[PDB]
Amino acid sequence: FQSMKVLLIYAHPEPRSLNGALKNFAIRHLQQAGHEVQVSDLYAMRWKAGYDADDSGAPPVGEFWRPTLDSKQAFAQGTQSADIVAEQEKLLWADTVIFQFPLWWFSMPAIMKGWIDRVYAWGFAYGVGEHSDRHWGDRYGEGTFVGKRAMLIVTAGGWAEHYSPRGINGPIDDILFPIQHGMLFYPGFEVLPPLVFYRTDKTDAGQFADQCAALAERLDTLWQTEPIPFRRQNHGDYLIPSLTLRPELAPGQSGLAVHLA
Amino acid sequence: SMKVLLIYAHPEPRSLNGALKNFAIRHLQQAGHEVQVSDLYAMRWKAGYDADDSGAPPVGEFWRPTLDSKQAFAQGTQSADIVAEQEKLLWADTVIFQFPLWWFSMPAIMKGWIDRVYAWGFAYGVGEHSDRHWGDRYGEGTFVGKRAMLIVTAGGWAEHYSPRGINGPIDDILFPIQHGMLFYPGFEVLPPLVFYRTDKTDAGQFADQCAALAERLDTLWQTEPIPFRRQNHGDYLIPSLTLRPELAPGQSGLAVHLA
Ligand SMILES: Cc1cc2nc3c(=O)[nH]c(=O)nc-3n(C[C@H](O)[C@H](O)[C@H](O)COP(=O)(O)OP(=O)(O)OC[C@H]3O[C@@H](n4cnc5c(N)ncnc54)[C@H](O)[C@@H]3O)c2cc1C
Ligand SMILES: Cc1cc2nc3c(=O)[nH]c(=O)nc-3n(C[C@H](O)[C@H](O)[C@H](O)COP(=O)(O)OP(=O)(O)OC[C@H]3O[C@@H](n4cnc5c(N)ncnc54)[C@H](O)[C@@H]3O)c2cc1C
Ligand SMILES: [Cl-]
Ligand SMILES: [Cl-]
Ligand SMILES: [Cl-]
């Protein structure tokens, strides 16, 4: 068989919302298939969003507290706040991590961004590895999360056409790049194509049934779907330390698309 | 003599950001401008938008982030912290958002200012939806006539944000903010001020940051805005909201939204 360990990070303030419905569907679907599921329901946990000096469990390491170096010490010395530590343990436990949220101002809800900011410590999600001739940190297809898969599940009010290649909001995959490339591929996840639902504010029973069918199909194929083929940083595709794509790859092109093989 | 609102997100007053914030405030005041500040961490800003913000029971069967904002804003029941920020915004001619880049985006506390202040009736959901207009947004809206600018500190190098740099081009990474959050409700958006390699800033580097910052501040009403395209004034097909085919012909992606 092979029972997978799935962690769902979920950001919506109302349990009877569309998002709440889809969350409950996904959790039941995965449990019925034989997988184990842990959930971080950020609003239910009253998750603290603003990273600050109370998270480091120690006085400042230098003359004044620094978001970076104070994390580096807290993580290395074992003083981080206990909420942080429990999330980090969930991530280490999981084989697959799913982030589920409504699109709010073209980005994660604040409370979810605060999960990123606080959980992704120095020594854990960044700051790991050497800086040398041909290696510039353990990131972008390397890091703590190598071997794990991640996927977003996003609901949006705008129409699909509004997120099309010439659509005014920007192409969906480019708007999601800071998340999928910067937050998921960065600490070493294999990132699956996102599941994005459009025109969600008017969802009725028939649209919901369509959403559920699409969701179940993604959840059934989590370990078969091909990841987004983002380029690794440290294995020849980029010049180091400029971290620019070598001239023979995607020649004469620039922008977000050059980072896909 | 201009009215400038600074929205500022950093937890430590002695930080590099705190030093830049103080410099900017003093520089603007010495020039004769009036400055209001929203120091989010100092105010203990609530970041998570929820039902406690709408000041009333749910308008329908269960609270909805959209419709309960529409009603709170229309009926005057939003939480007082929100109202006070909306008042600042209406007061200001120029709004500056100052933050360290954290995970290629604003700190959560600032994202939560956006999520909670930008109400239905204020920043979105205003106006006609038809075949000729699709909401008062993207170069139209409540903020038309105001200017906005980002001031961003990043740890990564400039080259890492270059057009072929691994983190993505800086202006593409900042698109959801500049186009999605600032141009959307009607600001003219000035080019961002972005400082790189900030974790190693020394006296010399700080002097260079200060000089760049002063220069931007001295030109806030002279600098040309980012030439983003208005949604409703002919560049786009409505309601598909796709750029009309003779403009940037054959091209696609974020760059087609600038003329
Ligand atoms: C602050 C904010 C910013 C936003 N920014 C953007 C943006 O940048 N881009 C964008 O495209 N959109 C944006 N939106 C819209 C947003 O993405 C949608 O409102 C959100 O995705 C809807 O999901 P929800 O869970 O909140 O839906 P809810 O409002 O809870 O519900 C939506 C509909 O689904 C129905 N529903 C619930 N459960 C069921 C069921 N079981 N069967 C059938 N129907 C069901 C509901 O009755 C309701 O009609 C924004 C909204 C807010 C509040
Ligand atoms: C959670 C997190 C996520 C991050 N993600 C990203 C990312 O996605 N992209 C990226 O590029 N970067 C990233 N960074 C790096 C971040 O952008 C930088 O740490 C930040 O810009 C530094 O600004 P600060 O105010 O926190 O600096 P501080 O840490 O306060 O100070 C930085 C340096 O400036 C010096 N300094 C302060 N005042 C002065 C002065 N008056 N004169 C001379 N020197 C001065 C300090 O001594 C210190 O060396 C991340 C950092 C964190 C904590
Ligand atoms: Cl790193
Ligand atoms: Cl709108
Ligand atoms: Cl045309």
From TrEMBL, chain A:
GO molecular function: NAD(P)H dehydrogenase (quinone) activity; nucleotide binding
GO CC, one annotated term: cytosol
InterPro entries according to UniProt: Flavodoxin_fold, Flavoprotein-like_sf, NAD(P)H_dehydrogenase_qn
Keywords assigned: FAD, Flavoprotein, Nucleotide-binding, Oxidoreductase
Flavodoxin-like fold domain segment(s): 5-216
Residues noted as binding FAD in the record, renumbered to the chain: H12, L18, N19, R66, L103, W105, F106, T155, G157, G158, Y163, D201
Key word Flavoprotein present: yes
Family as reported in the entry's similarity comment: Belongs to the NAD(P)H dehydrogenase (quinone) family.
Protein name: NAD(P)H dehydrogenase (Quinone)
Originating species: Klebsiella pneumoniae subsp. pneumoniae (strain ATCC 700721 / MGH 78578)
